[PDB]
Amino acid sequence: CQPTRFISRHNIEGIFTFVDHRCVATVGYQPQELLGKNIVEFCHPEDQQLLRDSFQQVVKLKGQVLSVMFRFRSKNQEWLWMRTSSFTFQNPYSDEIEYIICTNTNVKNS
Amino acid sequence: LDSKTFLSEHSMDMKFTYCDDRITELIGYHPEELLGRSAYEFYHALDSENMTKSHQNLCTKGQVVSGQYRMLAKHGGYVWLETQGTVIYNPPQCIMCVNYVLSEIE
Numbered sequence: 310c311q312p313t314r315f316i317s318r319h320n321i322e323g324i325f326t327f328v329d330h331r332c333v334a335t336v337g338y339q340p341q342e343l344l345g346k347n348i349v350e351f352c353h354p355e356d357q358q359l360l361r362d363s364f365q366q367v368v369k370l371k372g373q374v375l376s377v378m379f380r381f382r383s384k385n386q387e388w389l390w391m392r393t394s395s396f397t398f399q400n401p402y403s404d405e406i407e408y409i410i411c412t413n414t415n416v417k418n419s
Numbered sequence: 420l421d422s423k424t425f426l427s428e429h430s431m432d433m434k435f436t437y438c439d440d441r442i443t444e445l446i447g448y449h450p451e452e453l454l455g456r457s458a459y460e461f462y463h464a465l466d467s468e469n470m471t472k473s474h475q476n477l478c479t480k481g482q483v484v485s486g487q488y489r490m491l492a493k494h495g496g497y498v499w500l501e502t503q504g505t506v507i508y509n510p511p512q513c514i515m516c517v518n519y520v521l522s523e524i525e
């Protein structure tokens with residue numbers, strides 16, 4: 310069985326700037342319920358800081374993968390465990406600000 | 420009543436741009452640590468869809484009473500509050516919130 314997972318892109322603050330529509334079946338929100346909001350707003354109070362420090366670190370790691378586990382509030386208001394694997398991308402023909410590519414998977418905490 | 424009422428100001432995306440110091444002796448937060456952050460970071464999960472609805476009412480009507488919601492206190496537990504929100508437009512520039520603390524802590 311394939312895990313449910315969706316792709317998103319964020320700015321360095323954490324704001325969703327792109328959402329893969331596989332999110333409907335993963336967390337039950339439509340893409341536009343995600344777009345423009347920070348990922349920290351769907352996150353469990355106990356895990357918000359770790360997620361903030363994750364986004365801060367992802368940019369210092371030379372575009373290598375950073376993984377984080379946190380509880381994400383589905384459109385049902387249920388806490389789902391997510392593993393978000395993230396990395397920076399920065400097109401080297403330019404000097405535009407790097408952004409963050411995330412893969413977001415519903416995993417088991419056990 | 421009065422010593423349980425504080426003002427906050429928000430951008431149209433719900434981030435704090437200002438908060439009365441009074442929020443310290445009631446909920447624990449320092450105002451400075453509040454700015455740049457979505458109010459959304461702070462609602463209890465069970466009030467979240469309701470606040471979203473009030474926010475929609477607030478943007479469409481221009482003034483709303485939130486009805487009852489819980490805010491994650493600074494040092495654990497949740498405080499109940501009721502807020503009156505008012506959009507200040509100029510000639511939407513910001514949201515003024517009058518925030519009344521219903522309960523003590525948890």
Ligand SMILES: CS(=O)(=O)c1ccc(Oc2cc(F)cc(C#N)c2)c2c1[C@H](O)C(F)(F)C2
Binds near residue numbers: 473484504505514518
């Ligand atoms: C929905 S409402 O009543 O206008 C409202 C209430 C609290 C609101 O923010 C606040 C202010 C506060 F002191 C504590 C909390 C919490 N938790 C949220 C907001 C609103 C508006 O959405 C807003 F954008 F201005 C932000």
